[PDB]
Design a protein around this ligand. Structure first.
Ligand code: NA
Lengths: 135, 134
């Protein structure tokens, strides 16, 4: 799976340091961002930057409040990543994968990411998948 | 343990994507950098930037070829970090911790990092410690 890391989408650092996530992760959650779809890396990159700015400045979060973001360009964007927890109202012990324009396509990509996470020991073999994409 | 993350030492990104590191890590290796000691974060940041440039440009590595760097300013610098393995001749399953001006000071902080890694599930409770400092 192709991950667009933080530097490649011009991420700013967390405004203050994030809290470490205990591994292996035992719960994964798929959520919808309910922001405009995007279909190229340039377009999706721009959207992720905006998401981060909004989460930090408008919401008062320390950083973009997901671990990863699947987008319409079929890329996974690194958000808080494997090792740091999201903050409330998200669960600190879940890997949160957000979706910009959820679809059959990027859902399969996100599932591939989970499979890799399991193989690499980031995600427990005994994990729960919480699919909130319909809401 | 205070970790100076990549953005805070002005790291460039890997030249190309790195290989993922499997967890839990079963082996930690201590290696010497053979670079001048540094005693302030300003000075150590400069040294770590220089190490990364050296590894990428002179050695042809994709990125600084350590996971963490322990320095004389008593800081740990995030290099490849928890998630990505070092490339050859380093082992793809080890956590490589480099030392700038290796000392009893450096070692204590490095051991704290390991203890933190174990608590967080990054490192096996039964990890091997490979000492390449000499
Ligand atoms: Na050279």
């Amino acid at each position: 799976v192709k991950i667009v890391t933080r530097p490649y989408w011009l991420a700013q650092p967390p405004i203050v340091p994030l809290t470490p996530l205990k591994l292996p992760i035992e719960s994964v959650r798929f959520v919808a961002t309910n922001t405009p779809s995007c279909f190229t890396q340039a377009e999706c990159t721009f959207r992720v930057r905006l998401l981060q700015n909004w989460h930090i400045e408008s919401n008062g979060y320390k950083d973009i409040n997901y671990n990863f973001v699947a987008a319409g360009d079929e890329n996974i964007y690194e958000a808080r990543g494997w090792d740091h927890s999201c903050e409330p109202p998200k669960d600190a012990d879940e890997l949160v994968v957000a979706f910009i324009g959820p679809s059959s396509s990027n859902k399969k990509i996100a599932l591939e990411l989970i499979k890799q996470g399991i193989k690499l020991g980031h995600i427990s073999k005994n994990y729960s998948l919480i699919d909130d994409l319909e809401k």
